[PDB]
Amino acid sequence: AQLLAANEQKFKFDPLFLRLFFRESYPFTTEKVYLSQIPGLVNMALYVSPIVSGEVIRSRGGSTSEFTPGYVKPKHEVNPQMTLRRLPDEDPQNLADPAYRRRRIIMQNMRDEELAIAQVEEMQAVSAVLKGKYTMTGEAFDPVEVDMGRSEENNITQSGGTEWSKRDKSTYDPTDDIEAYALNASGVVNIIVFDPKGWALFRSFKAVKEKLDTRRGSNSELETAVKDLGKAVSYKGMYGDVAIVVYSGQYVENGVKKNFLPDNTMVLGNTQARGLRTYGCIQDADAQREGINASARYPKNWVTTGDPAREFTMIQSAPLMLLADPDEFVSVQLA
Amino acid sequence: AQLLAANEQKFKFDPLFLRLFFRESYPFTTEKVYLSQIPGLVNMALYVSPIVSGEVIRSRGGSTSEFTPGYVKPKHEVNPQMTLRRLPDEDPQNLADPAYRRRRIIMQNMRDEELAIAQVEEMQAVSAVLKGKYTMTGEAFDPVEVDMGRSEENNITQSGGTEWSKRDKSTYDPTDDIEAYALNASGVVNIIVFDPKGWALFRSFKAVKEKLDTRRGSNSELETAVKDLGKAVSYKGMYGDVAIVVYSGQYVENGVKKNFLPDNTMVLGNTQARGLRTYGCIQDADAQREGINASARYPKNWVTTGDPAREFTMIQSAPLMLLADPDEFVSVQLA
Amino acid sequence: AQLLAANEQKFKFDPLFLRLFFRESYPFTTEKVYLSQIPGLVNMALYVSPIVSGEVIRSRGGSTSEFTPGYVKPKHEVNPQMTLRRLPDEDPQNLADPAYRRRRIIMQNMRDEELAIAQVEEMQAVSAVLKGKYTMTGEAFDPVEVDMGRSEENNITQSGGTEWSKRDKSTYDPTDDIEAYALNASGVVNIIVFDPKGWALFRSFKAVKEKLDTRRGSNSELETAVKDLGKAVSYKGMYGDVAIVVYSGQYVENGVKKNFLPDNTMVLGNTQARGLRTYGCIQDADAQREGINASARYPKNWVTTGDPAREFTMIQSAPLMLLADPDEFVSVQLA
Amino acid sequence: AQLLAANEQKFKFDPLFLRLFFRESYPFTTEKVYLSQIPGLVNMALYVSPIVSGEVIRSRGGSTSEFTPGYVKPKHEVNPQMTLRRLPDEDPQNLADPAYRRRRIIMQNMRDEELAIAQVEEMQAVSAVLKGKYTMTGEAFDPVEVDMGRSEENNITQSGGTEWSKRDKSTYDPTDDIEAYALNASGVVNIIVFDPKGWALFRSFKAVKEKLDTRRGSNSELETAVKDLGKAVSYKGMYGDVAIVVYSGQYVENGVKKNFLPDNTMVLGNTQARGLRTYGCIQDADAQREGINASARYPKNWVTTGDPAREFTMIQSAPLMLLADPDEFVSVQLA
Amino acid sequence: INDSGAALGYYVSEDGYPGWMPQKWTWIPRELPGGRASFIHVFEPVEDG
């Protein structure tokens, strides 16, 4: 059992979703998300006559304001019985210390913990901006469908009508489809991040390959983001006007591993779409009596006396991240 | 209700228009803009004989001296009912204080306010140097067209005759068109800032891509400006003689977001073009009896007693920024 | 402008609805009613095996948890220009005092105010337990239908089939219909409160008049309730097993007066039916910064400086009282 | 964790079964019920000759003395994270206190607890005096059938032969059946409490409706009992000689609610039938070392340190209430 | 105080400097039983109570 302050990572490397589209964090002192409580977009046009001023403007009463945040509280043991991750030859005598082994093993345990919540949050993000629906579900828990409201024109499919696979691999240009799906996106699209084989049949067209610019032509901080997360986001290059990226991230589930992304999917939208990170109550007596009922995360190291007389690291959170405008992204399944 | 002095930002990050072309601020104690009152360019050649001296030289009587400044006075509430933007772990106990929550929420509110007036001012700027016309308009207000006087040769179009899209993507050099549009610009052009797809079809020509220098070759403080505003201005590089930039700024309107820039447009001109920031009267009793009738901006925090018994932050301004020489920039719609 | 504590009535005389069926008050710190948040009836049967114990039991997630409380905030003036209600000869010299006139006139004003909100709340109650539907409506406000879920067998009609008017006035006994409508009421009925002519044609049958006991036979505190509110609830007597009451309450609307009760209606149910008094946010800066965001009522006396330079008494509330079990009462329109 | 003495209710409102028929409590220091140990009815006739006296008389050795009491020990949390039941406007500042919230929430929790054990005990009672069989059962526990010994003539059925539904609704008198089932009841019957539709088809006969007296004619304290529990026991009136009651009590099980009573059933017997409330051991170290091994109920408030580091309210009991004379009541299923 | 008015103790709210500390009320008796002057509360009362 070590203090709360032993929670230093400086490792925030989420794959460009919770850090770039979903910056809009709202931890609450209350259980649910109350979209009426969030101001979101403000009623933002009307003025008043040059004699007096008008009424009082409020948070404009969101129609649906009741969903259950994913209160996730996992834990692990940091029992000093293992040989640990030994960074090359930094004096294993301190590993021989139970104190250093226990502290850096709580380091390792907790980092596994937040990357676990981060990967489940990224699955929530990919569900969110791929269908507008999120499955708040788990065993011994009712499945609540949390819908931002993704429209039908945001779910139009490439296989409908003519498929890119069922097209000329040399002369056909899918740019026409690119603006066709981008027009009904309530904004400009500046990233065309694909799943791998989706980008494969996208680039199979020649027009794509002599239309794209392999050069840097550094447009924004997206190159810096790729250099940071050189793991699963791949900056293919410029398609001229728009940036071409491929995400091949993978989640390692209970017995097997598989990619986050489905077979062939796309979301057309902006890099500055508004993403909410509403956070529920944290059900920990420590959190309430020290005021961490409204926060992002909560770690603790703590000893059980009695039957499971041991010591554990416990991580608690409650995210219900969504997208403010589901119509911002057009979600297309590809050929 | 907090004092006037609680208006500290040190955040002036306008996108290179009101800070680089339109430095020429003229807040007035009078309602309208009186271009005859502004000296502008001074009658600046004649001398007198070596015996005596001549007559008195004045501000040379601008022909049109009557336009309505955009007196913009929005407001918001800073009601201490929200959980606020929590910068990472700087003692949320002070957020628990109504005093600190209220002061940093008036900070947040007012900063939203000046960035709102800044973005509407940038829309005014883009209208101004893209057509020479500005729409001083709003509901319950007559639409006044404020024209600097952009000439026809400053509005000549690329689609007229032969389009760059309707040209050889490999051998054609658009530099010829570059000096063709630059010659009738009343000066030298040293920035070729495009909107994204405009620069896309500009660079689609090979001659462009082996004529441009990707290197820094740091010419001026424009690199410093890009490093400051790494958001929406993108320093593509050197085209040799001239700098290549792309602006992809976006305004987030009442229900949707969209780019400031039209589809394919260009303005050819200097970085030192003269831009006026005439400012009208500020209609606030506080402003008049303390002499802020002639200024840039005015904040206040103030309580309403009675029916809307609440407390608000109010921001008031009246810009009518224009360009001294509309002929300085040639405005071209691209292929 | 007098302090908050000058709000002493000790006059709670609501007509047996908000005090006897709808005791179940739930003022919230949040705008809407969240029936999922209210525990209501608790999942209340299952035990666990004599080895260990089971899972955690929650508030069992009400299906619909979003309705708009009737945030009612009226006001009046207490301008010391009137001669007031002079209780017989208690020294009118203090009425001659502006201080005493103003304080007892704010007394009179505010009491009118809570009896106004009480009478509108009683109209809400009569709509609620007469059809299960409530019209949350007003000009410049969308009409929300708030439905508890009154079933069809709770809305079966006496005119259907054979009417009591179309029956033998001497030999027919409406007791058969009494248990016929009481059986599908999810409980025992112990008050048969009628509207006046409804009870008139009920008692027109002889069997009723020699079956009813005019005697006191004091069953419960309902006699005490009638003695308290001797105005519009009339304890007719005993019908033997069940109590016979008649409500003839009247509301005095904008230009005219008329009874609360429709022509001929009945609700069959218990005296201990569960009634919720969910209360929304109170939109008053005073209420928020002193924590009266979650309460029943809020008075204030307050001066306006400027154009309406006067002084007013303001009353604010937000009730959305409903019935937990709409099936508890069978609502019948009579012959 | 609060002391044992914080267990004050003064709320004993069981529905006339455990308080009127089953007063005969026998908490033991031993696990099972030992009917041989209970004296029950005493051998109560023989005297001795007027010379000397006879042998020693014992508890007359009950034949079956081994059944498993329903040791029920549920619990709940009283975590101070909820807003609680707010009785109208008694100073919510004390609810703001964690001390007052925690104490009155343990009040609420524990009262839910004993009413839970009371409702399961009432289901045991209704099984007992409706068939003489009780199912001592639960998951991870063998189902023991505890039989008082209800005889066949105590289980004779109305549907056998001629049904009351299959009779004249006007001229047939079910009083003949009333004494027919009452004669083999080992005593006089003075309550004819029905389930609702059972009483409905009972009273459908005219002879019933002009034979019954709706008047009070207050016979005993049963009117007082109905006035106390005006919830689910309904004193229909006098049938002349006998009292007519209807029980419509309901239990709210794991996901749904339904009446205690089956569709159409009756038990004919006395109001003074002998009911045993044998109580087993209480398996709580606190209870043993302070001598509450032989008692009715045991509450406690207690903190867990370690993995479930929380605080709970725990209620423990072990009832095995039965009827001394199963032949006292004739159990009839109706038409 | 009691019904007779005898000043038993006091509820000291927490300091408010800087202008953003919350107030918490702490118990302080007026004097110790042995006559020790712990909380010297000297004020001039114009009337009783």
As beta bridge partners, residue D23 has: none
- Which residues does B237 contact at the CB level (< 8 Å), separation at least 6? B212, B213, B214, B215, B244
Contact C44, D119 (CB under 8 A): yes
Residue C132 vs residues C124, C148, C328: alpha-carbon distances, Å: 10, 5, 10
3-state helix, strand and coil shares in percent for chain A, rounded to the nearest 5: 25, 20, 55
**Interface test with chain D among A283, A286, A301, by most D beta carbons within 10 Å:** A283
| Dihedral, D122, D128, D129, D131 alpha carbons, nearest 10 | 130
Structure tokens at A160: 């409908």
As beta bridge partners, residue A301 has: A313
How buried is residue C15: exposed, middle or buried, by Cβ count under 10 Å (0-12/13-18/19+)?
buried
- Numbers of helices and strands, H then E, in chain A: 7, 14
Residue of C nearest to D260 (CA): C45
Contact E41, E27 (CB under 8 A): no
Residues of C in contact with A58 (CB under 8 A): 283
SS3 D207: helix
The stretches of C66-215 forming alpha helices (DSSP H) are: 93-96, 98-131, 175-183, 196-203, 206-211
Quick one: which of A269, A266, A274 has its CA closest to A183? Answer: A269
Neighbours of D237 (CB within 10 A): 19
Name residue, tokens 């009101």: B18
Contact A286, A300 (CB under 8 A): yes
- Which residues does A195 contact at the CB level (< 8 Å), separation at least 6? A246, A247, A248, A259, A261, A262, A263, A264, A265
- The answer to whether residue D96 neighbours chain A at the CB level (below 8 Å) is no
Residues of E in contact with B99 (CB under 8 A): 19-20
- How far is the C-alpha of D319 from the C-alpha of D298, rounded, in Å? 12
Contact B298, B284 (CB under 8 A): yes
Contact A113, A74 (CB under 8 A): yes
Quick check: do B and D touch, 3+ CB pairs under 8 A? no
Resolution expressed in Å: 5.6
- How far is the C-alpha of B333 from the C-alpha of B195, rounded, in Å? 11
DSSP one-letter string for A212-244: SB-S----STHHHHHHHTTTTEEEEEE-SSSEE
Residues of C in contact with A32 (CB under 8 A): 34, 37
Name residue, tokens 């499955």: A135
Pick the CATH number of A152-274+326-333 from 3.90.1150.10, 3.30.56.10, 3.30.1930.10, 1.25.40.10: 3.30.1930.10
Neighbours of D152 (CB within 10 A): 7
- Which residues does B211 contact at the CB level (< 8 Å), separation at least 6? B173, B175, B239, B240
Contact B135, B127 (CB under 8 A): yes
Residue D310 per-residue DSSP state: E
Residues of C in contact with D231 (CB under 8 A): 187-188, 270, 272
Backbone torsions φ then ψ of B263, nearest 5 degrees = -60, -55
**Interface test with chain B among A24, A29, A47, by most B beta carbons within 10 Å:** A47
Contact C111, C11 (CB under 8 A): yes
CA angle D145, D149, D150 (to 5 degrees): 110
- How far is the C-alpha of B202 from the C-alpha of B165, rounded, in Å? 9
Residues of A in contact with B257 (CB under 8 A): 186-187, 270, 272
How buried is residue D166: exposed, middle or buried, by Cβ count under 10 Å (0-12/13-18/19+)?
exposed
Residue C287 per-residue DSSP state: H
Contact A308, A165 (CB under 8 A): no
Residue of D nearest to A306 (CA): D306
Residues of D in contact with A74 (CB under 8 A): none
**Interface test with chain B among A12, A44, A59, by most B beta carbons within 10 Å:** A44
Quick check: do A and D touch, 3+ CB pairs under 8 A? yes
- How far is the C-alpha of D239 from the C-alpha of D190, rounded, in Å? 10
Experimental method used, please? cryo-EM
Contact A297, A117 (CB under 8 A): yes
Name residue, tokens 């005598």: A93
CA angle A241, A247, A252 (to 5 degrees): 170
Residue D65 vs residues C303, D32, D37, D42, D62: alpha-carbon distances, Å: 82, 8, 8, 16, 6
Neighbouring subunits of C (3+ Cβ pairs under 8 A): A, B, D
SS3 D196: helix
Neighbouring subunits of B (3+ Cβ pairs under 8 A): A, C, E
The stretches of chain B forming alpha helices (DSSP H) are: 93-96, 98-131, 175-183, 196-203, 206-211, 222-228, 285-289
Structure tokens at C160: 């259907």
Name residue, tokens 């039209």: B262
* C 275-314 near D (Cβ less than 8 A): 294-296
- How far is the C-alpha of B234 from the C-alpha of B227, rounded, in Å? 9
Residue C99 vs residues B5, C1, C2, C93, C104: alpha-carbon distances, Å: 41, 11, 10, 11, 9
DSSP one-letter string for A284-316: -HHHHHTT-SSSSEEEEEEEE-STT-EEEEEEE
- How far is the C-alpha of A220 from the C-alpha of B246, rounded, in Å? 11
Neighbours of C306 (CB within 10 A): 9
End-to-end distance of chain C based on CA atoms, in angstroms? Answer: 54
- How far is the C-alpha of C111 from the C-alpha of C297, rounded, in Å? 12
- How far is the C-alpha of D62 from the C-alpha of D59, rounded, in Å? 8
DSSP one-letter string for D268-297: E--TT--EEEEE-----HHHHHTT-SSSSE
Nearest CB neighbour to B83, from listed A27, A186, A215: A27
- How far is the C-alpha of D108 from the C-alpha of D313, rounded, in Å? 10
Contact B174, B335 (CB under 8 A): no
Name residue, tokens 């809020």: C298
**Interface test with chain C among D252, D282, D283, D284, by most C beta carbons within 10 Å:** D252
Name residue, tokens 């209360």: C279
End-to-end distance of chain B based on CA atoms, in angstroms? Answer: 54
Residue A30 vs residues A295, C29, D82: alpha-carbon distances, Å: 11, 10, 10
Residues of B in contact with E20 (CB under 8 A): 94, 97, 99-100
How buried is residue A301: exposed, middle or buried, by Cβ count under 10 Å (0-12/13-18/19+)?
buried
The alpha-carbon radius of gyration of chain C (Å, integer) is 24
Structure tokens at B124: 């005014």
- How far is the C-alpha of D161 from the C-alpha of B124, rounded, in Å? 96
- Peptide bond preceding B299 in cis form (omega within 30 of 0): no
Q: How many residues does chain A have?
A: 335
Residues of C in contact with A140 (CB under 8 A): 55
Helix (H) or strand (E) holding A210: helix A206-211
As beta bridge partners, residue C298 has: C316
Neighbours of E45 (CB within 10 A): 6
Instruction: Give how far C146 is from chain D: nearest CA, Å.
Output: 23
How buried is residue A96: exposed, middle or buried, by Cβ count under 10 Å (0-12/13-18/19+)?
exposed
- Which residues does C68 contact at the CB level (< 8 Å), separation at least 6? C31, C32, C136, C144, C280, C320
Residue of B nearest to C1 (CA): B306
Interface contact C289-B98, CB threshold 8 A: yes
Contact B143, B70 (CB under 8 A): no
Residue E23 per-residue DSSP state: P
Instruction: Give how far B256 is from chain A: nearest CA, Å.
Output: 6
Quick one: which of C123, C105, C122 has its CA closest to C13? Answer: C122
Neighbours of C227 (CB within 10 A): 10
**Interface test with chain B among E20, E21, E23, E24, by most B beta carbons within 10 Å:** E20
Quick one: which of B144, B149, B115 has its CA closest to B15? Answer: B115
- How far is the C-alpha of A225 from the C-alpha of C235, rounded, in Å? 79
Interface contact A305-D310, CB threshold 8 A: no
Backbone torsions φ then ψ of C165, nearest 5 degrees = -60, -40
- How far is the C-alpha of C306 from the C-alpha of C308, rounded, in Å? 6
**Interface test with chain A among C28, C29, C30, by most A beta carbons within 10 Å:** C30
Quick check: do C and E touch, 3+ CB pairs under 8 A? no
Residue D328 per-residue DSSP state: G
- The answer to whether residue C215 neighbours chain B at the CB level (below 8 Å) is no
As beta bridge partners, residue B145 has: B135
- Peptide bond preceding A196 in cis form (omega within 30 of 0): no
Structure tokens at B78: 């800073």
Q: In chain C, which ranges are E strands?
A: 24-27, 75-77, 133-138, 141-147, 233-238, 243-247, 250-252, 257-259, 265-268, 275-279, 297-304, 310-317, 322-323, 330-333
Residue of C nearest to D197 (CA): C183
Single-letter amino acid, residue A93: Q
Quick one: which of B249, B243, B244, B245 has its CA closest to B231? Answer: B249
Neighbours of C86 (CB within 10 A): 9
SS3 D27: strand
Residue of B nearest to A47 (CA): B74
Quick one: which of D44, D39, D31, D43 has its CA closest to D62? Answer: D39
Q: Is C202 left (phi over 0), alpha (psi -120 to 50) or beta?
A: alpha
- How far is the C-alpha of C217 from the C-alpha of C241, rounded, in Å? 11
Contact C229, C246 (CB under 8 A): no
Instruction: Give how far E37 is from chain B: nearest CA, Å.
Output: 35
Question: Half-sphere exposure of B239 toward its Cβ, with a 13 Å CA cutoff?
Answer: 23
- Which residues does B174 contact at the CB level (< 8 Å), separation at least 6? B164, B202, B205, B207, B208
Quick one: which of A271, A273, A291 has its CA closest to A281? Answer: A291
Name residue, tokens 């109170």: C282
CA angle B152, B153, B159 (to 5 degrees): 95
- How far is the C-alpha of B331 from the C-alpha of B194, rounded, in Å? 11
- How far is the C-alpha of C192 from the C-alpha of D62, rounded, in Å? 52
Residue B230 per-residue DSSP state: T
Residues of D in contact with C42 (CB under 8 A): 112, 252
As beta bridge partners, residue D170 has: none
Residue A108 vs residues A73, A115, A283, E13: alpha-carbon distances, Å: 17, 11, 24, 44
Question: Half-sphere exposure of D312 toward its Cβ, with a 13 Å CA cutoff?
Answer: 16
Instruction: Give how far D81 is from chain A: nearest CA, Å.
Output: 8
Question: Interhelix angle for D196-203 vs C175-183, to 10°?
Answer: 160
Backbone torsions φ then ψ of B246, nearest 5 degrees = -135, 130
Q: After which residues is chain B broken (C to N over 2.5 A)?
A: none
Quick one: which of B248, B310, B309, B299 has its CA closest to B112? Answer: B299
- The answer to whether residue C135 neighbours chain A at the CB level (below 8 Å) is no
Question: Half-sphere exposure of B273 toward its Cβ, with a 13 Å CA cutoff?
Answer: 30
Backbone torsions φ then ψ of C27, nearest 5 degrees = -70, 135
Residues of C in contact with D252 (CB under 8 A): 41-45
β-pairing verdict for D24-27 and D275-279: parallel
SS3 B175: helix
Interface contact B99-E22, CB threshold 8 A: no
Residue C194 per-residue DSSP state: B
